Amino acid sequence: SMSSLCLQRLQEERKKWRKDHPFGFYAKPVKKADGSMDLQKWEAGIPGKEGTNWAGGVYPITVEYPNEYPSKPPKVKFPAGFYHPNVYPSGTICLSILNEDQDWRPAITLKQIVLGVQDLLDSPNPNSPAQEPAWRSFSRNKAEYDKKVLLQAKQYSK
Amino acid sequence: SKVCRGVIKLSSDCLNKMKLSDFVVLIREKYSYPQDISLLDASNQRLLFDYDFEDLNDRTLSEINLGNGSIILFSDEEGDTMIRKAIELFLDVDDELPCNTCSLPDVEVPLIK
């Protein structure tokens, strides 16, 4: 039930990515039972920035494309339970460029998405409290926050 | 109306011996595609082969779940100004043409922006 434009744009995304993707990132369509690839569901990894508490970790996301892509944005998820003020308990990332009613435009490449997610790691957005306990720590117990973050960096070590 | 179309006539014998790598070779040289291509199962929408995904290179058409009435999408994936139009290919296997039959249809596939 993917539109032919969706198929066309997804094949191009995979191609632009090959030619040009940020250093240390990876993104690849999932392999299915039969041995073939699913262009609608991708696995990617986001390296934490150096000189920040996220350094050393490579953080796994899944990028899931709707049948109406690129009219509608992908759904991007860390694993459920991932710790960050702008990540839901389910793992869904809250980024304005991923919201159809906000800053998403069909021209947005997978590169722009992964760089946006990476920038979010160390700079949480106050207009998106998505995880209560993480927001509480960040706001009033920064030493408990930092510590949790450093643990998560070790958990997702390269 | 953008994707070109054609029916391939195949043998039931040919579907079990045809290697995916050579199947790509045949399609590329008939319609003048460049080196970097991608090959989809157009029905269930699985990616089966491209310039980087070569896991299925060695398998036969039946070994990658392509049978009677399966449709294939073949695209230009070079990223140049002039791009060869995509062609969609139906797989009609009848009983029986001489075995080892794989006749590609005559299709006028243009170079577009």
Numbering used by the authors:
A (entry chain B): 0 to 157
B (entry chain C): 439 to 551
Publication excerpt:
The Sumo-specific E1 enzyme [the heterodimeric complex between Uba2 and Aos1 (yeast; termed Sae1-Uba2 in mammals)] initiates the process by first catalyzing adenylation of the Sumo C-terminus, which next becomes linked by a thioester bond to Uba2's catalytic cysteine. A transthiolation reaction ensues during which Sumo is transferred from Uba2 to the catalytic cysteine of the dedicated Sumo E2 conjugating enzyme, Ubc9. In addition, for both yeast and human Uba2, the ufd has been implicated in Ubc9 recruitment. Therefore, to obtain a more detailed understanding of Uba2's ufd interactions with Ubc9 and to obtain broad insights into how E1-E2 specificity is established in general, we performed structural analysis of the Uba2ufd-Ubc9 complex from S. cerevisiae.
The structure of the yeast Uba2ufd in complex with Ubc9 provides the first crystallographic insights into E1-E2 contacts in a Sumo pathway. In order to understand E1-E2 interactions in a Sumo pathway, we determined the crystal structure of a Uba2ufd-Ubc9 complex from yeast. There are two molecules per asymmetric unit, which superimpose with 0.3 Å root mean square deviation (rmsd) over all alpha carbons, so only one version of the complex is discussed here. The structure of Ubc9 superimposes well with the prior structure of free Ubc9 (0.55 Å rmsd), with the most notable difference being slight variation in the position of the β1β2-loop. The Uba2ufd-Ubc9 interface is interdigitated, with the two V-shaped grooves from Uba2 binding alternating regions of Ubc9, as in a layered sandwich. Ubc9's Lys30 from one face of the β1β2-loop forms a salt-bridge with Uba2's Asp493. On the other side, Ubc9's Asp33 interacts with Uba2's Arg484. Ubc9's Met36 and Leu38, at the C-terminus of the β1β2-loop, pack against a hydrophobic ridge comprising Uba2's Leu478, Leu485, and Phe491 in the first “V”. The complex structure also provides only the second detailed view of E1ufd-E2 interactions for any UBL, and demonstrates a common overall mode of E2 recruitment by E1 ufds: a ufd's “W” (i.e., double-“V”) -shaped surface engages an E2's N-terminal helix and β1β2-loop. Finally, docking the Uba2ufd-Ubc9 structure on prior structures of full-length Uba2 indicate that the Uba2 ufd would need to undergo significant rotation so that the Uba2 and Ubc9 cysteines could face each other.
